[PDB]
C-alpha cells in the first residue's frame, strides 16, 4: 500500500509547520489518524471518495473520474494525491484547513492537540 514511517512523514510535512497555528507534531498525528501514513489510501465515504495521506475528497476538493461535477477547489486531479510527492497534497490541505478547519480530519482536536512529543521523530 506504500505506507511511510513516522520519521519520513515528519520530514515530509515540514512546510505545514505552524500553519494555521497547527504544529508539525500535530500534523503528523493528523496524518496517522486519517490514513495511517498510507499515501495510496482511497476510501469510499457516504457521498464521496477520499484520496491519499490527507484523505482529500472528490466532491469539493479534487476532481476524479467518478465525480466530474467536483467543485475542484484545489484545482487538481485526485490521483495526484496517490503518489509519493506530498507537495500538492500539502497545498490542498492548507486550503482545507483554511476553509473548513481541523474538523475535516479530527472528530475532536484533542485527539492530536495533546501529548505531542510522541509525534516527534527521535532520529532527527
Ligand atoms: Ca502528491
Swiss-Prot record:
Superkingdom assignment: Eukaryota
Binding site for Ca(2+): 80, 83, 85, 88-89
A Gene Ontology term for the protein's cellular component: extracellular region
Carbohydrate attachment residues: 46, 75
Occurrences of domain C-type lysozyme (ranges): 2-124
Disulfide bonds: 7-121, 29-112, 62-78, 74-92
Keyword check for Disulfide bond: yes
GO molecular function: calcium ion binding; lactose synthase activity; lysozyme activity
Keyword Secreted: yes
Compartments where located: Secreted
Example of a GO biological process term: defense response to Gram-positive bacterium
Family annotation (SMART domains): LYZ1 (SM00263)
Alphabetical UniProt keywords: Calcium, Disulfide bond, Glycoprotein, Lactose biosynthesis, Metal-binding, Milk protein, Secreted, Signal
Tissue: Mammary gland specific. Secreted in milk.
Function summary: Regulatory subunit of lactose synthase, changes the substrate specificity of galactosyltransferase in the mammary gland making glucose a good acceptor substrate for this enzyme. This enables LS to synthesize lactose, the major carbohydrate component of milk. In other tissues, galactosyltransferase transfers galactose onto the N-acetylglucosamine of the oligosaccharide chains in glycoproteins.
Assembly behavior: Lactose synthase (LS) is a heterodimer of a catalytic component, beta1,4-galactosyltransferase (beta4Gal-T1) and a regulatory component, alpha-lactalbumin (LA).
Family: Belongs to the glycosyl hydrolase 22 family.
Matches recorded under PANTHER family: ALPHA-LACTALBUMIN, LYSOZYME C
Name listed for the protein in its UniProt record: Alpha-lactalbumin
Lineage of producing organism: Eukaryota, Metazoa, Chordata, Craniata, Vertebrata
Gene this protein is translated from: LALBA
Amino acid at each position: 500500500m506504500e505506507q511511510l514511517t513516522k520519521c519520513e512523514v515528519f520530514q515530509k510535512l515540514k512546510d505545514l509547520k505552524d500553519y494555521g497555528g497547527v504544529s508539525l507534531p500535530e500534523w503528523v498525528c493528523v496524518a496517522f489518524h486519517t490514513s495511517g501514513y498510507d499515501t495510496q489510501a482511497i476510501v469510499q465515504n457516504n457521498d464521496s471518495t477520499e484520496y491519499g495521506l490527507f484523505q482529500i475528497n472528490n466532491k469539493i476538493w479534487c476532481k476524479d473520474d467518478q465525480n466530474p461535477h467536483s467543485r475542484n477547489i484545489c484545482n487538481i486531479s485526485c490521483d495526484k494525491f496517490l503518489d509519493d510527492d506530498l507537495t500538492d497534497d500539502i497545498v490542498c490541505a492548507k486550503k482545507i484547513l483554511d476553509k473548513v478547519g481541523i474538523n475535516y480530519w479530527l472528530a475532536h482536536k484533542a485527539l492530536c492537540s495533546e501529548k505531542l512529543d510522541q509525534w516527534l521523530c527521535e532520529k532527527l
